[PDB]
Amino acid sequence: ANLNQKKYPAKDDFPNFEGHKSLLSKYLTADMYAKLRDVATPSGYTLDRAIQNGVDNPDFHLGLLAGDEETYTVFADLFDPVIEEYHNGFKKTDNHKTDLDASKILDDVLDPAYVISSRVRTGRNIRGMALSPHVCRSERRAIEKMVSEALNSLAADLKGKYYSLMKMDEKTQQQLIDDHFLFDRPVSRHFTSGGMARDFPDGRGIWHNDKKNFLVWINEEDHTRIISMQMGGNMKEVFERFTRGLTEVEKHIKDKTGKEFMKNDHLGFVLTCPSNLGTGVRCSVHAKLPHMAKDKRFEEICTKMRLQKRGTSVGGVYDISNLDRLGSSEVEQVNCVIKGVKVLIEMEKKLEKGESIDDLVPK
Amino acid sequence: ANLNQKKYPAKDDFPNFEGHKSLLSKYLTADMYAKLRDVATPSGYTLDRAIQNGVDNPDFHLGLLAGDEETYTVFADLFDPVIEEYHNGFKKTDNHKTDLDASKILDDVLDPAYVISSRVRTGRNIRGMALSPHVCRSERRAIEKMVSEALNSLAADLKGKYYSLMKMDEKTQQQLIDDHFLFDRPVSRHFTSGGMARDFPDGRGIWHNDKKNFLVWINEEDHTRIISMQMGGNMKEVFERFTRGLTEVEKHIKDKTGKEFMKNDHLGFVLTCPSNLGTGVRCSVHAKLPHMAKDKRFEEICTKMRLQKRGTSGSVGGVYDISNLDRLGSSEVEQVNCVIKGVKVLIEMEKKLEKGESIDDLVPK
Ligand SMILES: [Mg+2]
């Protein structure tokens, strides 16, 4: 912390939020800032650090990042209401329930003429270590060691290889961009304002299995980002492999180091960005929906079905994923995607024939 | 600091300097890092913050940024040898002498046929305040207040106007851009890795006089960057206005706040990047030297006269920005007079080459 800050009136340190569009700017009042300015977490993370992402970027919707598990409680005055609004009324008294039971996922296979690929991604942080905005090189390397040792322990169709981002041959970097496996190196304003780019590429890397359907990015925005993906529409298969991977990686880490994933009854899994709390899950498809793209109801229809659509901007190809993360389970979110993409595909198919979809539109 | 870091052995924290090209990588050994990793300055700046700029950017030459004046002492084991190498042998036991006496600047006007423009630039920080990698919003605002008040007080030829960067309208932004008056927003990795981009545009501004020949940037890399510049070769006039402006601003800050510029007997003016210590002066002319440009000795002649040259254009060929090489260990008077004397010689050599005569006897040996 800058030790002379505490000597100035808090009003002199209060961010100027004129022109800001963030939940940070909405909830961090003058009086709240003066209350918490000089309160640090047990690892040394400060209020200013926590909000720097929003203060530097008035166009961001959220504006906050956690530096450690305790950020969420030490600064609960700020984090609680931002989480409540972002997550559609999820109160400090509400609690989050996990459900990783792959037997409960809808077994429909999404039509592969429309669904290019199906994916389930999540994040996990290791309890006992600071999060990316705050983590130091020794912490980050320890995380790298434990996570990569757990991944290198996977066998059969989960057998793979770890690729450190520091150790990278030229026939290597090219190949991984080739599969598109490489995470963007951290130049966006979101990563640099949030302290998350420090030391790059030290401590970061990418693990994938040989069959290229299970992939883990290490020490990016969360200590791990775990992704199961495959061609076509068999979402239940993707989820089953996701859960087995997750289970075995967790087991290895606990058996070898005693460490566990950050998690609590209130927030479920703790992630760096409050937008990702709860399940941390982005369950998506890449779907070819060019008639839906020409339809002015497309965003509204997605929203009503609890889906987000994200395009490249081409082709009418959209990433379609779950909007909801906190206060519903993984099983619910994945099934929401399956149910809703099924409807989009049926609509796309009617529109190709110049037929009505008006009766398929959700209430 | 991250309180968890002290839980781990220093070896686990030591940067991996493979492929680095910086003086940081050359001097920060494993044992020195172990010694200093958990030592902070009184304001709380840490070793890892000071080195972050270079750890993130293997090609940067220095790789270090100071967060406060104490950075240089608390981490002297690292800063001293980096300073000694970059500044051509300036030792921890050497002390810098300041001389800002404008009456000592040579009055030669460099030939206007050859000298297009003349500029003197320096930076100053405010003693006892954190530097840009570390400063908080309240300090940075108080700096803007005391500096902008001082500049607004200036009169006569120095009368001018302050432009805050917050909420600057597009009309003004365009005018200042056209004048080459506005500084870059801090998107460069030098600024992001060094913690100098925080809160932008909060606390930042630019001031210039109505005559547009004196310009100040507030809260960019140093708390102030101060520039005096005009067309032609009257460097003595440029320096006189520079020093008069600096004297008046410093006197106003001293009277209104009791603060003054950050400076000590060893390093002279204390700036954020160790490259700018001592005088922090870059005294330059643009000079039309197309024949010297084709002489293979041009560079060694410059170094020998303690000048640096850099090609420039924007279209007439053969133009060079010729500036002082030294910052630490010689005075502002010495560095500005080195430019004036050096450019005089270059123009004589250039005039000889124009007639295909030899310069063999004029090259210092
Ligand atoms: Mg801090």
Swiss-Prot record, chain A:
Molecular function via GO: arginine kinase activity; ATP binding; creatine kinase activity
Binding-site residues, ATP: 117-121, 180, 225, 282-286, 310-313
Keyword RNA-binding belongs to the record: no
Enzyme class: transferase
PTM annotation: The N-terminus is blocked.
Xref: Gene3D superfamilies: ATP:guanido phosphotransferase, N-terminal domain, Glutamine synthetase/guanido kinase, catalytic domain
PROSITE patterns: PHOSPHAGEN_KINASE, PHOSPHAGEN_KINASE_C, PHOSPHAGEN_KINASE_N
EC number(s) on file: 2.7.3.3
Protein family (similarity comment): Belongs to the ATP:guanido phosphotransferase family.
Name of protein: Arginine kinase
Source organism phylogeny: Eukaryota, Metazoa, Echinodermata, Eleutherozoa, Echinozoa
